[PDB]
Amino acid sequence: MQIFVKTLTGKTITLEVEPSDTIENVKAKIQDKEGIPPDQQRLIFAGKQLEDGRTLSDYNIQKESTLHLVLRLRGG
What we know:
The chain is of the alpha+beta class.
């Protein structure tokens, strides 16, 4: 299925995912498509950050849902 991922510039990218994807695997797919390491990615739905070890299914995220991607340089 396809989902949308909106960025802080308003750019929306389309990503092919499965409901069975962990959020970590969604970030790996963003890394494959766009070259950004998962450690630099914050994924947001309903205004609250998604947890790496849950799935899109666990959030009831469906085809053409729109997530938010915020980039951050890794923590110290």
